[PDB]
UniProtKB/Swiss-Prot annotation, chain A:
The chain holds residues 395 to 443 of 1273 of the full protein. Residues 9-11 are annotated as: Integrin-binding motif. This is Spike protein S1. Binds to host ACE2. RBD also interacts with the N-linked glycan on 'Asn-90' of ACE2. Cleavage of S generates a polybasic C-terminal sequence on S1 that binds to host Neuropilin-1 (NRP1) and Neuropilin-2 (NRP2) receptors. Interacts with host integrin alpha-5/beta-1 (ITGA5:ITGB1) and with ACE2 in complex with integrin alpha-5/beta-1 (ITGA5:ITGB1). May interact via cytoplasmic c-terminus with M protein. May interact (via N-terminus) with host bilirubin and biliverdin, thereby preventing antibody binding to the SARS-CoV-2 spike NTD via an allosteric mechanism. It comes from the Viruses. The gene is S. Attaches the virion to the cell membrane by interacting with host receptor, initiating the infection. The major receptor is host ACE2. When S2/S2' has been cleaved, binding to the receptor triggers direct fusion at the cell membrane. When S2/S2' has not been cleaved, binding to the receptor results in internalization of the virus by endocytosis using host TFRC and GRM2 and leading to fusion of the virion membrane with the host endosomal membrane. Alternatively, may use NRP1/NRP2 and integrin as entry receptors.
Amino acid sequence: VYADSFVIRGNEVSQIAPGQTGNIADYNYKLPDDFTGCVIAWNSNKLDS
Amino acid sequence: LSRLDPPEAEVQIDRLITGRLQSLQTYVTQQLIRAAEIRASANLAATKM
Amino acid sequence: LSRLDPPEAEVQIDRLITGRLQSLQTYVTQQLIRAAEIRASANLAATKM
Amino acid sequence: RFASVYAWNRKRISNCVADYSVLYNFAPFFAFKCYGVSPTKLNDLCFTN
Amino acid sequence: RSYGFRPTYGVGHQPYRVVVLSFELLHAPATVCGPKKSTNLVKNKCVNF
Ligand SMILES: *[C@@H]1O[C@H](CO)[C@@H](O)[C@H](O)[C@H]1NC(C)=O
């Protein structure tokens, strides 16, 4: 199992998905087109801003 | 392909591949009957000769 | 069945059932023509006898 | 100010180069749901109005 | 470039924390497994393995 973790903006959360492109899915973190796994995202405004 | 992301492109073109294969199978199915119809007449012509 | 829940299992296996039925139908369709081809020769052999 | 529902306004956009990645910074929306076209390739198409 | 995470921003601009879990379901010696208990091994009889 491989676990990756980072912090992004709420706008770009939809860009962490296979076949997606954008500002964050092009130059920062790109998922493979045949991904087999899970993605978890939660709000952290009270401790990261 | 130019208007839909591959996640949905592989669903859209999957509805064309099956239809075109169904279109293609009927052609050979009818040719396989026309061939036997022609073969009967060819055998009759050979006997007459 | 072991990796996908029933709501999507009945969608995944529904794409295999139709394909296997289509695969099975062509077999009998071609056998129904080979049988007639054989029957013609059987009739000819009976006449020759 | 935004117009009321019973008197919704319509604005025509034409004769300009449209970049759809800039409107992400213009409003704090989250979904951006599209029906007839994937939002990924909206920048690769030419419309008439 | 750097973010500007502040409490003033609303939803869609607030920071989000993301964790991605990646598996791979192939035929190879497995190390990580779920919490299930093994049983004894029976042979030469029709069983569910
Ligand atoms: C909206 O317009 C106002 C006035 O022109 C400006 O102060 C503000 O920065 C603009 N906001 C965005 C997100 O463009």
